[PDB]
Amino acid sequence: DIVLTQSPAIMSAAPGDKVTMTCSASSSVSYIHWYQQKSGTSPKRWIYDTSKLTSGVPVRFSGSGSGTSYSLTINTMEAEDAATYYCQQWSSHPQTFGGGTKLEILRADAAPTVSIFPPSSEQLTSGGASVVCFLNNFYPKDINVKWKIDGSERQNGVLNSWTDQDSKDSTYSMSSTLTLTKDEYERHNSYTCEATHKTSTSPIVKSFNRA
Amino acid sequence: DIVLTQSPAIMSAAPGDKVTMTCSASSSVSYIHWYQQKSGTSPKRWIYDTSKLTSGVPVRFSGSGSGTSYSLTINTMEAEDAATYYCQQWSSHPQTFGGGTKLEILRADAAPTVSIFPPSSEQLTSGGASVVCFLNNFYPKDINVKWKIDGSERQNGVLNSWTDQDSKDSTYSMSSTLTLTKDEYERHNSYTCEATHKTSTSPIVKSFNRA
Amino acid sequence: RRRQLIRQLLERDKTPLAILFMAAVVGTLVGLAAVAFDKGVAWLQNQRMGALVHTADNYPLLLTVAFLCSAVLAMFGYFLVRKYAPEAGGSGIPEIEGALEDQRPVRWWRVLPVKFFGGLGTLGGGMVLGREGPTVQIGGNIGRMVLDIFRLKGDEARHTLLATGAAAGLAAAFNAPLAGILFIIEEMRPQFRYTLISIKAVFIGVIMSTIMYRIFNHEVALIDVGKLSDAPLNTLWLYLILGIIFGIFGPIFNKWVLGMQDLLHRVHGGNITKWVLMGGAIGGLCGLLGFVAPATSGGGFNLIPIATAGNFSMGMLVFIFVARVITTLLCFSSGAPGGIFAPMLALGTVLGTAFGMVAVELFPQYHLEAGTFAIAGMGALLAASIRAPLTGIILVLEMTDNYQLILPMIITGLGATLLAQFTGGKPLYSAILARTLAKQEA
Amino acid sequence: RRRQLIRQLLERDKTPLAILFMAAVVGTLVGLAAVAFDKGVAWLQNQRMGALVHTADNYPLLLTVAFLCSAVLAMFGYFLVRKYAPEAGGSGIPEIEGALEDQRPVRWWRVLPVKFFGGLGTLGGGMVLGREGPTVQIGGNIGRMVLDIFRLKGDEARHTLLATGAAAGLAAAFNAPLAGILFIIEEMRPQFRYTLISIKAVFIGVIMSTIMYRIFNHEVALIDVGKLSDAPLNTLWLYLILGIIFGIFGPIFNKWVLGMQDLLHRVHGGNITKWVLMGGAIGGLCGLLGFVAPATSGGGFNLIPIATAGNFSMGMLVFIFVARVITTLLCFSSGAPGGIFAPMLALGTVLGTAFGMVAVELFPQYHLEAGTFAIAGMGALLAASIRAPLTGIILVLEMTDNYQLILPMIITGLGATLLAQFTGGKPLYSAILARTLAKQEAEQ
Amino acid sequence: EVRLLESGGGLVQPGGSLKLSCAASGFDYSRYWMSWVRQAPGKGLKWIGEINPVSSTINYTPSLKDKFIISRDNAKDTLYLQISKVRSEDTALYYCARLYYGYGYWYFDVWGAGTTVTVSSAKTTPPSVYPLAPGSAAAAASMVTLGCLVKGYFPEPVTVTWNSGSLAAGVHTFPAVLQAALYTLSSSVTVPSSSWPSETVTCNVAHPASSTKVDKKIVPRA
Amino acid sequence: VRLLESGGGLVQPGGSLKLSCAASGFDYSRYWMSWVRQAPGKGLKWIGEINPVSSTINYTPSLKDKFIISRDNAKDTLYLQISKVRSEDTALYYCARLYYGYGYWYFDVWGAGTTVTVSSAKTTPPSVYPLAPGSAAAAASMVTLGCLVKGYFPEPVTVTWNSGSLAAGVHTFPAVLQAALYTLSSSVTVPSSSWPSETVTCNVAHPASSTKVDKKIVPRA
Ligand SMILES: CCCCCCCCCCO[C@@H]1O[C@H](CO)[C@@H](O[C@H]2O[C@H](CO)[C@@H](O)[C@H](O)[C@H]2O)[C@H](O)[C@H]1O
Ligand SMILES: CCCCCCCCCCO[C@@H]1O[C@H](CO)[C@@H](O[C@H]2O[C@H](CO)[C@@H](O)[C@H](O)[C@H]2O)[C@H](O)[C@H]1O
Ligand SMILES: CCCCCCCCCCO[C@@H]1O[C@H](CO)[C@@H](O[C@H]2O[C@H](CO)[C@@H](O)[C@H](O)[C@H]2O)[C@H](O)[C@H]1O
Ligand SMILES: CCCCCCCCCCO[C@@H]1O[C@H](CO)[C@@H](O[C@H]2O[C@H](CO)[C@@H](O)[C@H](O)[C@H]2O)[C@H](O)[C@H]1O
Ligand SMILES: CCCCCCCCCCO[C@@H]1O[C@H](CO)[C@@H](O[C@H]2O[C@H](CO)[C@@H](O)[C@H](O)[C@H]2O)[C@H](O)[C@H]1O
Ligand SMILES: CCCCCCCCCCO[C@@H]1O[C@H](CO)[C@@H](O[C@H]2O[C@H](CO)[C@@H](O)[C@H](O)[C@H]2O)[C@H](O)[C@H]1O
Ligand SMILES: OC[C@H]1O[C@H](O[C@H]2[C@H](O)[C@@H](O)[C@@H](O)O[C@@H]2CO)[C@H](O)[C@@H](O)[C@@H]1O
Ligand SMILES: OC[C@H]1O[C@H](O[C@H]2[C@H](O)[C@@H](O)[C@@H](O)O[C@@H]2CO)[C@H](O)[C@@H](O)[C@@H]1O
Ligand SMILES: OC[C@H]1O[C@H](O[C@H]2[C@H](O)[C@@H](O)[C@@H](O)O[C@@H]2CO)[C@H](O)[C@@H](O)[C@@H]1O
Ligand SMILES: [Cl-]
Ligand SMILES: [Cl-]
Ligand SMILES: [Cl-]
Ligand SMILES: [Cl-]
Ligand SMILES: [Cl-]
């Protein structure tokens, strides 16, 4: 089967940059197609027949290539172009897909907004206690989160998860979740999570007291 | 609108014999259709555009007519030809059907088998007494039933019901129900049902005595 | 010149009312005749079917009543031709073309009855022959008949009435009015000089003829193939290839028909008794094949929708093609009254489909349906052999109603007519007229 | 002449390979030119739209930039014609017909650029004119151009190449290959004597032309009307009536176009400055009407599917018809380069539909759809006015793909051509050639 | 097959409204005009009206402003009839038909079985089922006729079978008679004297409108 | 014009299952339809295609009846059965209408996909816990509420807020597996005026268990 290899697996760029990504075929193909797949979305036919645009694809996009070398070009990328792009061939059967180019956006700084939540009444009734910390809409992505219980430092039972980059404002968000039994939670009083990000030398820290 | 009048509104005819019904319009009409209806059954398009047979309609069937008069015909009537036949027009608007023509088999006269039944113990307990009389499997359909209580004619509280012409044997049937309170029923002793058919001057009395 | 042209431009399209009205009556009559001819053929094919019923137990007696029933009907038709109207043999399109050249007589007092009743016999016995032969000749003759009855004079009237009768005749045979008119404009008109044939009059006669057909035929189509898929641009080259195959086969098939006219003549030497007996054996072969392998016999319209829907195996298609090439030649070349036009439709379809089945397996990336090639081949033998491609294309369109295949149909058709030319083949109808006119000056 | 015939029969259909191949290159070029012409017209109609955006606030400034934008484009086209190629005015089908008679020159070094760029101006400004005029003349000229480049000799080649170029021209304008060939065979060929025009060669050029069109146009149809209902036999007489109406209107409409050519000439006397300014005002009227009532202006293809689907009130249809009869005459009779063929399609549809709406209300027993009459009327003005009914019918079929209406389409068409004959009308294209040939002599 | 299945018909009170439905299967239901016709008890066919495939045209019989409302859901492949201000006059068997034409004078191409509408203020009432046995000193003959009385129910219909449908020969069921807002009927079964009372004869009765299923063993009296 | 696929969820290895795709908004007949799948965080892989009459049926190089694609044009529904299911069958499966322009076919329109999980675990519905600010309403211009969605299997759950009335200001976090269960949280940011002044509730759906939970977020008093 034809093997399609797409250029950077992953590439960063700033709105206003001309952006180019590459599809290579193990043997000659023609009239290849391109799909756009934004986070949480189905692939969406974007470019077809090498260079034709599907209706409602903005003109900043263009396709080209032939033989074993095809590209997709954004003549000045826009932040909303954050997605993974797939190329595709059916000049030979069966048809096949590139591995994808993930396009990431580079923008100015944004500092986390931190929120802390005590285990809910409902949850305590079940015999568990999850302390939950939201860190929303920051940039860049790298961020550290630090759990202090009663002043000490907890490293067991903490679960973090980042969203992908936002399609409109290119920020990231993250949650950190401390999991303790209804008992362990009670044999303490002060819970505080600390967020460390490049937009500040001093950590943003939020807390509450069980009392 | 256009009024369509079918002719032998009802009619009987022996198998392997020549049947002819008629259809007539208050004004001039073109290309009349004809539907056949058995009871319990959806009307079937039988003949259309005045003379053309629908797929399946045996060839003994045929239509004809012009302007203000039209007709259906069965050269050699069969048994399964027993049905009601409706004519229809749409040359004018809006379209109007005919009142219909009932086509029943003709056969040898037969006598009713008469049968009488006392009120069940189940009904009496509830205070009502129905006396039922079956006049079963007779031809032709015209018949008379007379009730006697202790040898005296009774008219009130009597309802009769005729079946439609039977399928297998082409006979009729007819039930007669005398309804009284348990009280009136108990005052008396002898209950007679007298069927006066055509196949005799001497009615077929059936009866019982409570004692 | 400029003087003369300017006077002519200002007088363009003024067909005499007499010709227009008579064009109308010509077409009405031809329609009715074509209807009647059609009803008759079917009625006899039935009788033949009901007969095999009374004798469906004795497989030998079965095969015997099939052969004889069709042998008798066949002979009757051959005889009626040889005896009273020898130019009502075979198609009759070559004859009507002759008449439009003013090189052949339109013996309507003789052909109408001979061709009509003659054809009932060959067609009704289930021979591989088409109704269009009969209907075109019958229709031409009808055109002469009303020219004579009403003693209309002039070249225009003779050519016009003759042309409309033939067009109304093709139209009524396929329920294809457009093909009816195109056939005259492209194929049957005098090919090498101007004529006074009025187009408006031919149109009128075709309308009337087609209306007559619809009055006795509506709600049912000759060929129903449904809606097939479309044809992608990158698929077109495949239709060109198919046309090229039809283009080399075209002329080769022409040779066989002509040569087989020769070969079969030697058999009876020209003798109306050996001849009729020969037609009785061919006619019996066909009524027999009609029971033991219907696809090898008959008009062939029945197997078209089946072929197009890919419901035959490749093995069957090859069988059918070869068989039907055989039974097609035997019947038409034998001189029996009836067309070769329709049978060439069946040959085209069958061939198309086989090519399609191969295309389907070589290029799964094309997402092909065998049927689209069937539809493109349908009119391709016509285009390669008789060389009337625009008529073939518009006829198939009219019968199959798949307009989205117009490009691949035209490409297969053009490729066919181009390769037939380049391999030294000739328009069949013209080669038949030619040879008929060459015996008339030797 | 028997032995002569026998010779000719045996030699039938042997077009010289040189002519066949050159027919192929003629069609390819015509297709590309038609595509390019089409893309250009659309691109200018856009620009004009985007302009009314920058000024959609000041309703007066709005109406003004619509008029001027189209006035300028119009004048540019009129000028290009009057100055370098006067026979590239109006349709050009009458001219190519002339050339096939050998009575008019094919000045391809002049017409190609004039008609092409000229038409972009008139069409792109939104005037009521068709692409087929341009594409047929452009295509004919292209046929001569490759005859000359490759110096092919003989009557056959000159007539063939010229004919295929015109057919490929009609085909590429409507995406209608069959109509392209039929138009030559029925309408454009020399009408009164034999010709050596090769049919097989014309076919080849039309194929190539149509393929060129499909390469830049597929997935979208000029006119999509869907599948309409069938037509019952007892309904046919209604189509005959409609034909008869088209038949009496046909010639009357012809008079107006011819007479309006006369009337409009008096205005500028023949003077390239008054003339260009006249076309600038007609062109501005159209670009303006284009904003304040689109249905009264432009090619009219847009309103066909709408009319066919019964989505216009009777009031609107009458309005549109009258309006468009007006703007149709003003534009074509004025001498601007461009067809009257397509605009006659719009007039036919609109008329058909109005008849259909009446038929629907008089005969509920017929279960009619207004659209079937719209489809039958579409090619009827063509049949009554230019008298090419087989071309009209097959063209409409190709564009609307409603084959089940073939009978009522043919009946309306025949009735139209019959009543135009009997009321003393003439084939329009032939009446325009005639009058052009009558001036190219009355000057002696 | 081509199948038309109309439903939605039951008992409704005078001045009520109701929505009938017709389910089309086995043909392209787009492309056809559809129609409603109705047959009032022991009477003729009457045309209600028709709907074209695009609902652009809808015609009704010469009757009343918003009385009937025909509409269709081509996607659901179903036709609809709303009736309003329902009178007893609207009590009828209602038929769904697919329309077509030959020469062009339209006919009623294929019909469904129908649904019954009963317009009445009488209330739903289950039947009392009673055995009809031959009298004590009955004339034991070759054939013996038995029965059952199905009394005081509303509305129609009920169904009666004998021995669960095995006894099929010699059965008839009389048409129901209506009195004082209630229906009565009875069923006759004739068997050979060797069958009864040696084996069991039973009338099974159903009246789904009241959710009533009931069996009645017929047994000799005294 | 939509493609809705279902039948996703849990199957035990070696077992089989049947995905349906319900097309609508176009003439489902006379369209070649297709199936493609995407393993978690991986790329697209073609499964098969079936023509509008099921005359032709094509497949990626699988084994026996590994895949069985099928269509009921009468219901405008597309089908896919997988047998002898192994971990490689764990993926998101998309239905797709096929089409072309010049002839080289493309995947015209895609459905949302349905998710197949090959595991031996149990299907467990989620517990949903409301997350409101602790007794410390330190009001800013805006407030941030969330919900905690815990202990479900298999993926996925979908979270909305006021049924997607609140669209802006919402993030849902990728789930995380532990003890063969999934947990995630959703965050919403609304003005301090809009809450508690007005109702905010999170609506959780977990198709696999056919379960929806809609929990209202209430302040802590
Ligand atoms: C009577 C005349 C009417 C018939 C017209 C139909 C012509 C058929 C062409 C269909 O395919 C075209 O032909 C090219 C072959 O010439 C093919 O290869 C073309 O593209 C291929 C790669 O897709 C490469 O082989 C080449 O660059 C190039 O030849 C390619 O499928 C396409 O362009
Ligand atoms: C009348 C004017 C035009 C005349 C010629 C018509 C067009 C030219 C012939 C067909 O065109 C191409 O020829 C190529 C050979 O050069 C083929 O190569 C290839 O292209 C195929 C594309 O499917 C591959 O599968 C195969 O390797 C191979 O057939 C290709 O199929 C085909 O498109
Ligand atoms: C935008 C640039 C133009 C388009 C491209 C032109 C390409 C080269 C051709 C230029 O024009 C040439 O010269 C003459 C016209 O100037 C023509 O002869 C003509 O010259 C005379 C012009 O007066 C006529 O009277 C003669 O009959 C006739 O042979 C000649 O054949 C034509 O090729
Ligand atoms: C390579 C790039 C393009 C360069 C073009 C080169 C080919 C031009 C050929 C032009 O040929 C001349 O001009 C006329 C055709 O233009 C023809 O007769 C011309 O002169 C006649 C004078 O009687 C008149 O018929 C007409 O002007 C005309 O036919 C004829 O062939 C010759 O006089
Ligand atoms: C260029 C060719 C023109 C195409 C002609 C198309 C066919 C002619 C019109 C349609 O045919 C009509 O059909 C009517 C039904 O719809 C006939 O009604 C007929 O009705 C009765 C016969 O049933 C007769 O008494 C009446 O005279 C007669 O009007 C009517 O006569 C006839 O005109
Ligand atoms: C070559 C063939 C001749 C040319 C074609 C002639 C076409 C017209 C001939 C007869 O058909 C016409 O139309 C109706 C019959 O179809 C007749 O009555 C009509 O009158 C009513 C008009 O309101 C309609 O509702 C009815 O369809 C109908 O009876 C009408 O009088 C008649 O003239
Ligand atoms: O044969 C009877 C048949 O034809 C007759 O016409 C003549 C014709 O006029 C001549 O050309 C002659 O050569 O052949 C025919 C037979 O003599 C009758 O006049 C005609 O009425 C009849 O149908
Ligand atoms: O019915 C026969 C028919 O024949 C006549 O026509 C002549 C025709 O005029 C000539 O060309 C002659 O050579 O042959 C034809 C034979 O039909 C009459 O015109 C006509 O009255 C007569 O009925
Ligand atoms: O007076 C002119 C002349 O025109 C008609 O002839 C047509 C003919 O029908 C066709 O062959 C067409 O291509 O050329 C001519 C166009 O005028 C009339 O048929 C004829 O009577 C009339 O005299
Ligand atoms: Cl012959
Ligand atoms: Cl033939
Ligand atoms: Cl002009
Ligand atoms: Cl000629
Ligand atoms: Cl024009």
Numbering used by the authors:
A (entry chain F), B (entry chain D): 1 to 211
C (entry chain B): 17 to 458
D (entry chain A): 17 to 460
E (entry chain C): 1 to 222
F (entry chain E): 2 to 222
Give excerpts from the publication.
Chloride-transporting membrane proteins of the CLC family appear in two distinct mechanistic flavors: H+-gated Cl− channels and Cl−/H+ antiporters. CLC proteins are membrane-embedded homodimers in which each subunit acts independently as a functional unit. The pathways within each subunit taken by Cl− and H+ have been delineated mainly by studies of a homologue from Escherichia coli, CLC-ec1, which is uniquely tractable at levels of biochemistry, electrophysiology, and X-ray crystallography. X-ray crystal structures of CLC antiporters show the Cl− ion pathway through these proteins, but the H+ pathway is known only inferentially by two conserved glutamate residues that act as way-stations for H+ in its path through the protein.
Inspection of the transporter's intracellular surface reveals two watery clefts that might potentially allow protons access to Gluin. One of these—the “polar pathway”—contains five crystallographically visible waters embedded within a cluster of polar side chains, some of which form salt bridges. First, this residue forms part of the protein surface that separates bulk water in the interfacial fjord from the protein interior where Gluin is buried.
